[PDB]
Design a protein around this motif. Structure first.
Motif, short mmCIF file in Angstrom:
data_model
loop_
_atom_site.label_atom_id
_atom_site.label_comp_id
_atom_site.label_asym_id
_atom_site.label_seq_id
_atom_site.Cartn_x
_atom_site.Cartn_y
_atom_site.Cartn_z
N UNK A 83 0.96 -1.22 -0.01
CA UNK A 83 0.20 -0.01 0.16
C UNK A 83 0.79 1.09 0.01
N UNK A 84 1.69 1.43 0.92
CA UNK A 84 2.49 2.51 1.21
C UNK A 84 3.59 2.73 0.00
N UNK A 191 -9.55 3.03 1.43
CA UNK A 191 -8.38 1.60 1.29
C UNK A 191 -8.90 1.31 2.96
N UNK A 192 -9.13 -0.12 2.73
CA UNK A 192 -9.21 -1.09 3.92
C UNK A 192 -8.01 -1.97 4.14
N UNK A 193 -7.27 -1.92 5.14
CA UNK A 193 -6.47 -2.99 5.29
C UNK A 193 -6.76 -3.93 6.36
N UNK A 210 -4.36 -8.41 3.84
CA UNK A 210 -5.38 -8.12 2.60
C UNK A 210 -5.58 -6.44 2.49
N UNK A 211 -6.01 -6.05 1.34
CA UNK A 211 -6.21 -4.69 0.79
C UNK A 211 -7.71 -4.67 0.21
N UNK A 221 -3.16 0.13 -9.47
CA UNK A 221 -1.96 0.47 -9.06
C UNK A 221 -1.45 -0.51 -7.92
N UNK A 222 -2.38 -0.90 -7.02
CA UNK A 222 -1.71 -1.88 -5.73
C UNK A 222 -1.53 -3.12 -6.67
N UNK A 223 -2.49 -3.48 -7.43
CA UNK A 223 -2.04 -4.97 -8.14
C UNK A 223 -0.63 -4.97 -8.83
N UNK A 224 -0.28 -3.76 -9.50
CA UNK A 224 0.80 -3.63 -10.19
C UNK A 224 2.10 -3.97 -9.10
#
Ligand SMILES: [Mg+2]
Ligand SMILES: [Mg+2]
Ligand SMILES: [Mg+2]
Ligand SMILES: [Mg+2]
Lengths: 379, 379, 379, 379
Positions: A83-84, A191-193, A210-211, A221-224
Motif C-alpha cells: 500500500x505505502x 482503502x481497508x487494510x 489484505x487490501x 496500481x496496488x495490483x501492479x
C-alpha cells in the motif's frame, strides 16, 4: 440484498465449473498452460500475478467490505508495505495514529522514513487534531479504530471528509473490528487494510494480509505492486483464510458476548484500575463506536492498580488464556503490550502504559474464561 | 566434509526432538506460548518473525550455498524487493544485467527508480564494461549467470573484485544454475538471490524466494526487513520447497543430460539459426561457465530462421513441452520470451529477439522430448 | 468442570513443548527416529500406528464425547468397517435401523452378510421391537438418532439397557447430532461412530471418520484393527477436522436457529405435505429428543404434496441451497434421498419416500435461506 | 510409445481445463454440485466414491504399471485389506510368502483367519513348492519380490502360470521394486499392491496404498469395496504421492547406484557374515531378478558375525542412516527387523534372523553413507 454470512460462504466461491466441487480447490501451481502464445485459460498465466484460490479470497473480501477489488498478501505487514510503496514517494507525508500496532509504527518510522517519507502521530479520536496536522505534502491519513491496544475510537466518516478536502486518501486498518462489525468503505474510506492473521483467518494458524479498495484505478496500481514486489498470499494460506471467513459471523458474535461478560468481571475488581472496551458507556468515543460498529469486539484491555509488576504476574498466571502475541483466534490470548507487542514503540509517542494487560477474548465457554481471569487477578 | 546431496536432505532437518518425526513438521501456526512474559520456547514468538518450518528451509539453503544466514520469502520478487529496500536508499545507483528476468527489470525501473534509485544495464560478460559503469553512488552490482533468457555468462569472481574495489555489494541471482551447479558466495558474492519457484522447489507447484548471505550483519539487516515488510514464505510453501530441495541433485543431473541431448537435436536442424547453451564450446563465456559451473543447466534457447512467425508456430505445436511461463520444474516448458516473460522489457536495453524460443528441458524420457521438438520444428 | 467449547479448542491441544506453537503442527511424516532399537520418542514409531496430529484429534474427540479412547479413520465408512470387523465374526447377528445412511445399509447387507454376519432392520423408535428382535447371536444394536433422512428418534438409554441385558454392545452413530447436541456414552452407549465429514469438520472439505469408546479394552481391540487394516485419517485431514471442531458450538447454535426458522416457513406452506424435524412437538419421539438432545439439529426433511415430480423440481430450483450429497457444512445443501443418497436402499426395508426432500440448513443469513426455499417451492 | 519418466509426470495429469494450471489442483472437498438431480459434473458426486486429485493418482499408477484401473487407499495395509475383503470369503485359502512384511502376515493370520480364511506360508522362490501348496479352496497366491526383509526373488511369470492353472489370482506386492524396476501385470499378475508410503511417495512424508489391476471387472469389484469400506487416500496425501512419483525414476536410479556401492563396502567387511542383495551374482534367484527387474533396488540386508548384540550396536551407531521403521525415502534408514518391523513374525514361519540389519539406502552423497556404515560396523 444478500446478507453478510451468505456472502462470506458464497462470494468468490461458486462451485467448480468442471467437477462441481463445492469448496474452491487449492491451486498449488506456479504456472498455467496457454493455448497458443498469449492464449490464456480463464485469464491465468503465473501464480504471483494471479492464482485461482487467491482470486476467490480476494473476491470474497471485496464483497464483504463492499469494495471493487481485493488483494491478498503474505502478511498484514506486507499489505501495508505494498500500500505505502504504491501511494507514497520520497517527499510525501503520512498522518498515523498515536496508538497503533507496533509493526505499523516500525514500518513507517524505521523503513519509510529512511526512504524519504515524513510522518506525524496524531490523536485520531480528535477530528480537529487530524485537520490541523494536514500538511501540503500529506498523501494519506492512516486510521486504526479501535486502536491496538487501547481501543480508542476514530470517526471514519469525519476523517474521510478531512482527508478528501486535502486531496489525501483515508486508509482504515479494520483488523480489530473485521468486516462483520465495521465497513469503512461505506463511510468514505479509500482503502481497508487487514491482518487476516487475526479475526478473518480466525484460528491462529495463518499469517496473511489484505487490501480492499473502492476505486478500480487505485486497485490496478496496488495490483501492479502486488505482482512486481511479489508479497503475495500463497494458495494454501489463502484457502485457510477463506475457510476461516466462513465462520467470522458466528465467531465474532461469540467473541463480543464473551468480551462483554469479561468486562463485567473486570469493572470494579479491586485489583483493576481501568477497563478499556468500546462498549462501556464512559469509554472515550463510545457514541462514535455505537454509530459505526455492529458490536464492540473481542478485545479488552485493562490497567492493574499494582503497576507493571502486577500486570506481569496476571499474564503468567492464566491457565485458559494463553500468554502469546497475536489476537482474533478462537483461543483466548493474553499479553503485556509494554514488553511484548509494543516494546517497538517504547520511547515514542505510541509508548503503551507499563501497567496494561491486553486480552483477546476467545470463544471458549465464558465461565471458564471468567474463572481463569479471576484466579489470575488474585494477589 | 558432508556432500551436497546429504546436506540437501539433512541440513536444518534433524529429526523432531519430542516425537522423532523424520520430516520437519508443518508449523501452521501464527503464534507461540511464552513461559512468563518474554519466556520464549525455542526462540519462537510470532510466525512472520520466525516459524520453525521456515527456519528449516532457511538453514538448509544457507548450508547449500555455504552462507551464514538464509531468509525465505513469498516469491523471488519479494526476496529481490526486501534485498533492495535493505541495501539501497534514494540517491543510490545499481548496475543490472543487459539480459535479465523481466520482473527484475520491472522492479528496478518501475518501482525503485520512482523511489530515487538510479540504474544502468551493463553487459556483465565484459568485466571492463562493469568496471567502467561504477559510479560514486553505486551500492550493488546485480548479476544473473546464466542470464534469462539468452544464457550469457558472467565471471562471478572477477565481478566480485570490481564490486569490492568500489565498496559495493555483488548480488548473484543463482536461480537458473541452483546451488548444485554454482556457489556464488564461494567466488566472493555478498548475496545470493533465488526464485525457489524454479529448480529448488522443482515441481511447478510453489511460488517462493530466498536470500543467502555470507556476512551476519547484512543478514540481520535483511531479517529486519523480512520481519518489518513481512513478505515471508508461509510454512506449507516453505515445506514443499524443502521437499523439492531433497531431489535437486538427481533432478539437475537429469535436466543437464536431457538438455545436452536437446542441444544436439537443435544444432544444425535446418529451421534453427542459433542455439544458446553454456555447454556449447562456441557459446560466449563457455570457458567461464566451465570454471564456475558443475554442469551447464536445463535451459536451452534458440532462434528460428523464419523469424517471430516460425517461433510462435513452434511454441504452439509441442505436445510434451507445455506452453507456459516459468521454468525449473520436472515437466518440460516452452515459451516465447518476446510476447510472454519478456514483453515487460520491450523498448529497453533488455528487449529479447522476436525469433527466440526458450526451453526449460524437464526430466521426462529424453527421446519423447527430442521427438516432440522435432515434430514441432517441422514446417 | 471445563465446558464443551473450551474442550473443543484445548483438549488434546496443549501448546507445542519445544516451540510453544499454539496450534498442533501437521506431522506430515511416515516414520520416527528411535534412540537405540525400541527407544521411542514420545511413544511414536510409524504413522499408521499413531501420528501426533491424529493423536490430538483422537484425544479431543474422546474429551468431547466423554470417552476413554478416540480413533480417527479415513472416512465414516472406514470407522464403521473397522468397528464391525473388530466386534463381529461369521455367525454373528446385528440389529440395524429401519431408516439409516445408505452406506451403513450397503456395508452391512452387501459386504458383511457375504462374510457371514446376519442382520435385521428394526424400528429403533419402538423399544419393544428392539427387545423382541434380539437373537442369541446378536452382538450389537446399531442406532442412528436422529435417523438419516427421516430424523426419527431412538431412546439411547432405553436401548442401552436392552443391549446390555443381551450381553450385546450399543453402537450410536452420533453424526447428525454431534457431541455438542448429544453424548451417547453418558446414556450407556458402548461406542460412538461419527462421519467427521459432516458437522465435526464442518466445512464440506474433509472426508473422515471416528470412533469413541467408554471401555479401554474395546478401545485396544479397535486400535489393533486401526493399525492392522490401516484405514487411518491422514494428518492433514485430521488437522482440518480438528480445526473445524473448534467452531462446532457456534456453528451448531446457528444451524439449529436457522433450521427452526426454515421449519416455520415449511409448516403450512401449501405445497408441503409433511415437515420432519425433532423439535416439532408432534414429531414422533419429540419428548425423547427433548430428554437426550441439547437442541434439535440443522437437518430438516419434508414431503411434497405433488409427489416425486414436485420434489425433483424443488431440488433443481434453489439458488442458495446447493444440490449435492453430504450435510453438516457451513453451506446449505439440498438433495432428493430417493435418487441420490438413498438410491442404495431402494427395494429394502430402508427405502425412502419418493416425495421427500432433505435439507442441511447451513449458517448463511436466515432470510436468504427462507427466501430461496420459498421461491423454489413456488409451482 | 511414451517412456516411463514421461508418463510419471503427464499420465492422469493434463493441465486443468478451466485455468490451465499445470499441476493437478488439491480438491479438498467432500461433495459436488449437481445440475438437477443426478446431473453430475465431470462424473463427480462424493469424495469417498471419487475425488479428482485421487483420480489423477489412480490414472497415473495405472499407466505406470500398464493396468486398466488404479485405486488409492489410506495406507498399504488398507489396500491389502480392501483387496482381500473383495477376492476372499469364509472358507477360502491363501498362499502367502515365507518372508514378508510383518503387517501382511498380521492382517492374514490375526484378522482374516478369525473371519474364516485359511492360509499357508510357502517358499515362493521354489515354483514346485507353490504348485504343490495349491488347495481346492485357494483363491490367490500373494507374492512379494524382492521379499521384506531378506530380498528373496520369485519368478512372477512362473507363479502366474501356476495360479491361473488353479483358477486363482496372482497378487504381487511391488512395493520394494516399484513400477520403475518391475511391472508384474506384464508377466501375468492379476493385481499389483503398493505401499505408496515407500518409494512412490519417496519422501517419508505420506502414508498411502494402491492397487492396480489388469481386468476391468475385478477393478469394479475392488472399487465397490473402496467406496463401501471407505479406506481411501485423502486428496492432499494423494497429491503428495503424485508429486513424489514425478521423481521416481531419478530417485530409483540413485538408490540403485548407492546400494551397489554400499554392497561393495559390506562384502568381505570382517564384521559382516552375509550380504543380501538381488544384484550379487550368488544371491539366490539372481538370474530371475536379472530377467524381471530393470535394476536391483535400494534395499540391502546383512547379517553380523557377532550376532544380535552386534546388529543392535550397528543400528544405534549410524549418524547419517536414521534408526526408524519404513523405507523408500530419499533419506537413508536402518533398522533391526527382529525387534522392530518383524517383531510381529516372531514365533511363526516368517521369523527373521536376530543377527540381521536392514538398510534402505537413500540418495545422499554415497561416500557419506559408506563412511557412516564403516564407522558404525567398527567394534
Ligand atoms: Mg468458477
Ligand atoms: Mg530440532
Ligand atoms: Mg504436547
Ligand atoms: Mg483435465
Amino acid at each position: 440484498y444478500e446478507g453478510f454470512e451468505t456472502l462470506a460462504i458464497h462470494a468468490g466461491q461458486e462451485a467448480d465449473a468442471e467437477t462441481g466441487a463445492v469448496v474452491v480447490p487449492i491451486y498449488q501451481t506456479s504456472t498455467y498452460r496457454q493455448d497458443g502464445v498469449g492464449g490464456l485459460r480463464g485469464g491465468y498465466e503465473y501464480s504471483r500475478t494471479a492464482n485461482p484460490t487467491r482470486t476467490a479470497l480476494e473476491e470474497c473480501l471485496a464483497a464483504l467490505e463492499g469494495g471493487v477489488r481485493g488483494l491478498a498478501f503474505a502478511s498484514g505487514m506486507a499489505a501495508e508495505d505494498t500500500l505505502l510503496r504504491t501511494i507514497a514517494r520520497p517527499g510525501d507525508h503520512l498522518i498515523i495514529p498515536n496508538d497503533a500496532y507496533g509493526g505499523t509504527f516500525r514500518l513507517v518510522s524505521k523503513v519509510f522514513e529512511r526512504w524519504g517519507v515524513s510522518w506525524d502521530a496524531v490523536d485520531l479520536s480528535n477530528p480537529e487534531a487530524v485537520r490541523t496536522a494536514i500538511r501540503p505534502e500529506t498523501v494519506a491519513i492512516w486510521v486504526e479504530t479501535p486502536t491496538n491496544p487501547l481501543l480508542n475510537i476514530a470517526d471514519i466518516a469525519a476523517l474521510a471528509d478531512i482527508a478528501h478536502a486535502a486531496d489525501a486518501l483515508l486508509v482504515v486498518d479494520n483488523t480489530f473490528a473485521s468486516p462483520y462489525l465495521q465497513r469503512p468503505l461505506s463511510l468514505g474510506a479509500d482503502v481497508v487494510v487487514h491482518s487476516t492473521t487475526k479475526y478473518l483467518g480466525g484460528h491462529s494458524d495463518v499469517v496473511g494480509g489484505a487490501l480492499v479498495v473502492a476505486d478500480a484505478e487505485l486497485g490496478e496500481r496496488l495490483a501492479f505492486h502486488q505482482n512486481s514486489m511479489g508479497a503475495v498470499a500463497g494458495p494454501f494460506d489463502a484457502w485457510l483464510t477463506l475457510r476461516g471467513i466462513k465462520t467470522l459471523g458466528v465467531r465474532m458474535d461469540r467473541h463480543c458476548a464473551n468480551a462483554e461478560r469479561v468486562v463485567e468481571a473486570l469493572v470494579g475488581h479491586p485489583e483493576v484500575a481501568e477497563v478499556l472496551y468500546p462498549g462501556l458507556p464512559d469509554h472515550p468515543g463510545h457514541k462514535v463506536a455505537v454509530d459505526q460498529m455492529r458490536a464492540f469486539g473481542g478485545m479488552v484491555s485493562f490497567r492493574m492498580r499494582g503497576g507493571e509488576e502486577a500486570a506481569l504476574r496476571v499474564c503468567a498466571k492464566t491457565k485458559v488464556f494463553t500468554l502469546a502475541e497475536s489476537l482474533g483466534g478462537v483461543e483466548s490470548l493474553i499479553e503485556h503490550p509494554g514488553k511484548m507487542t509494543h516494546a517497538s514503540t517504547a520511547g515514542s509517542l505510541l509508548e503503551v502504559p507499563s501497567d496494561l494487560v491486553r486480552l483477546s477474548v476467545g470463544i471458549e465457554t465464558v465461565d471458564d474464561l471468567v474463572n481463569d481471569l479471576l484466579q489470575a487477578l488474585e494477589p
